[PDB]
Design a binder for this molecule. Structure first.
Ligand SMILES: CCCCCCCCCCCCCCCCCCCC(=O)O[C@H](COC(=O)CCCCCCCCCCCCCC)COP(=O)(O)OCCN
Ligand SMILES: CCCCCCCCO[C@@H]1O[C@H](CO)[C@@H](O)[C@H](O)[C@H]1O
Lengths: 421, 422
């Protein structure tokens, strides 16, 4: 009486729900709880096969990522962005890159891998998910501007961490470069081609995202889309429209969708103020939309973390426990602050250090974690090996768990030393 | 016709569907023929959605969509109004349904040479009703509250049972679904008596279990204080599907379990007579948000169902038996439905009865079950049902849906004028 695929998916959902409940009730972060649940229903009870978790992940990756990043777009205020523009821009143009690179050198050293493979690991481990941190920021009443900068940086790095990961793989394997990557690389080498392609991708993604967000907003006003179930379905369709159009012209559809989310989140700012009645109407609409889509992003998160927990291979992670652990603490202590370094050039050091140290790794790399493995199994290419895929995945899991728990636990005392003085 | 990705296909269905939804609400036209026409456009007309792919999508949207749609439907039922018109409701969902399916089987078998089981399958498919496209005209013309309650509740119970009957007709024609309680009972007391007793069994067990998991659900939520986003939505979805799978493992329609669960959750006030208002407030709000989510999902499911149905038909078979199918549809509307609706017309004035009869078209559930016999034919090679006959059934169902919906949504003012002088 083994579980069918439907009962399997549902098992993931239900178990994830219970895990969520006990997580909230107890006060423990949802990340290691969801991972734990994964291992429980996974390799332990063998209720869910890892080789199936691969494919379920092959859907939940694209879907969940797009919807989650889109939902993240809404929680961004353009005002606070432009007010603290340089800091954020540095955090999402330099700090990310340097984090990924140092992390890559670390990986290369610890596992004797290539620096390109390490760069893949770093690109995966680049983005940050502080959604695990926020409740403590609130209940300990940390600086509002700090929370602003951190959260904003995350919202921006989540899709950037992806396109970074897509770069490294595109370098390792020329499979489905799209055309832009292929052309730009064949004209200006692999690395420089990667740089200019990064610039291109970012440019077109931001542009198209803003464009589609605005046009969608205006479309809503014109056609009058404020009532159930039009607003939800339309907004969803808009997000995935941005994603598919973006990916169609070789741009990060994730980033596009995120940007669209930012636009809709800042609908009150872009076009002329209407009468308070209309503003309230649009407000209600956006509230409904946000509700539905954020519910979807919640489910998606649950599935991502649980699947990851049920997909890992115990023997591989144990044979490299210490190694990947020191890679984790290595990137938490050495990489992140080193990359953060130019912050104190425009910030106070006591601020800069907290901002550096605090940022952990979360959902996005957890989704990207199995990608190199699955891609290795499928494409079956010599450059990246299946074993190294297992290595990557294991490491990513380790640094995710360790970063999350260490940040979550070391945050209280760290305020006392940085607030009081 | 450049090949799309699977994801691009799904998204295309979504986008086009939403566009057609907007257009539907704006123009005032029923969403059903707009959706189906849309699917037809992006389907065989443009070949952006290969029919094979359509089958593959519909094999998922069937399960997931139907479950969530029905579970959503459960919420909109009042036990009070049920008590108010209990015998009528029970009659319609039980007797009138079976009779409808049977007569439809007769007609279907008449139009072209077939087994009576094929026709019975056809009737069991279109057994359920969907007045969702009628309500905007009901409140528009201030129609009697009682009859609306009757029709709505009727459809609410007809949607799962219609599948159960469809589950029955399938169980006979295929050896796969055979092995089970139904096989035992039918072999024991003949196909007829066995069918009836398995009907009673499935209904009873599914209902009782749905009530059980419903109460257990409400009590659980009550104890662990599930009100804050997003615990409630996730837990609700989990609950509905739990009921589904558990119910299905006991050889009973899990859909019916989902519906009953939805009924239980819908009538939260009725469970505890006295409870301090605060609790009822938080509960009402949480339930409301949950309803928003699950109903949005239900809408998406509806769209996908109708559009997919639109893209899954082939104009060759459709045209080939065009007149035939039309005769079937008209036969069902004009003859079958009222003939099956007569039993408890004793409680209702003849004009009102003729109204109830002449109303109640076929929508979502038959649209989902339309391609079911074809898929099974393509997968299980029955000596009873063929692929082409699956095509005949799906086509006939499509025509039935279009005709019934369009007419019964369009003729309502005139009909009201006939029974209520105007
Ligand atoms: C994680 C993000 C959360 C939000 C996502 C949307 C909400 C879903 C949340 C998770 C739901 C948990 C509950 C599990 C649902 C049960 C799924 C049933 C799957 C199933 O059995 O499919 C089988 C085949 O699948 C196949 O053939 C594969 C078909 C491939 C296309 C599937 C695409 C699905 C997209 C649906 C989107 C529309 C829904 C509204 C969002 C059917 O096989 P059978 O038994 O019928 O075979 C015999 C007939 N001859
Ligand atoms: C079923 C037809 C109505 C569907 C829309 C459901 C309306 C739910 O409205 C809900 O009200 C809550 C009250 O705080 C808000 O917090 C939620 O954001 C909002 O979605």
């Amino acid at each position: 009486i083994e579980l069918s695929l439907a009962e399997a998916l549902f098992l993931i959902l239900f178990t994830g729900v219970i895990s969520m409940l006990i997580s909230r009730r107890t006060g423990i972060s949802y990340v290691p709880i969801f991972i734990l649940t994964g291992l429980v229903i996974g390799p332990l009870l063998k209720l869910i096969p890892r080789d199936l978790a691969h494919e379920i992940f092959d859907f939940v990756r694209v879907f969940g990522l797009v919807i989650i990043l889109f939902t993240e777009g809404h929680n961004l205020s353009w005002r606070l962005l432009k007010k603290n523009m340089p800091t954020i821009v540095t955090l999402d143009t330099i700090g990310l890159i340097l984090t990924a690179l140092i992390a890559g050198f670390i990986f290369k050293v610890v596992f004797n891998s290539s620096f390109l493979l390490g760069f893949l690991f770093g690109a995966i481990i680049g983005a940050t998910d502080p959604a695990t941190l926020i409740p403590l920021f609130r209940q300990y009443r940390v600086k509002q501007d700090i929370e602003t900068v951190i959260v904003t940086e995350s919202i921006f790095n989540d899709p950037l961490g992806i396109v970074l990961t897509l770069i490294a793989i595109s370098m390792l394997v020329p499979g489905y470069g799209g055309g832009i990557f292929s052309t730009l690389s064949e004209k200006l080498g692999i690395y420089a081609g990667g740089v200019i392609y990064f610039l291109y991708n970012v440019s077109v993604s931001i542009s198209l995202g803003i464009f589609l967000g605005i046009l969608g907003y205006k479309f809503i006003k014109r056609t009058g889309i404020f009532d159930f179930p039009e607003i939800e379905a339309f907004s969803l369709s808009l997000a995935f429209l941005g994603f598919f159009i973006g990916e169609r012209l070789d741009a990060s559809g994730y980033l596009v969708a995120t940007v669209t989310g930012i636009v809709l989140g800042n609908y009150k700012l872009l076009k002329p103020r209407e009468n308070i009645r209309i503003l309230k109407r649009l407000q209600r609409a956006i509230e409904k939309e946000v509700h539905f889509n954020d519910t979807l992003a919640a489910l998606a998160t649950i599935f991502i973390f649980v699947l990851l927990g049920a997909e890992m291979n115990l023997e591989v992670i144990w044979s490299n426990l210490g190694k990947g652990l020191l890679v984790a603490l290595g990137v938490m202590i050495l990489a992140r602050p080193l990359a953060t370094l130019p912050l104190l050039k425009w910030w106070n050091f006591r601020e800069y250090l907290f901002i550096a140290l605090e940022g952990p790794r979360g959902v996005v790399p957890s989704a990207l974690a199995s990608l190199p493995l699955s891609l290795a199994l499928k494409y079956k290419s010599p450059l990246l090996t299946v074993h190294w895929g297992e290595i990557i995945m294991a490491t990513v899991v380790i640094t995710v768990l360790t970063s999350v728990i260490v940040e979550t636990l070391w945050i209280p005392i760290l305020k006392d030393k940085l607030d009081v003085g």
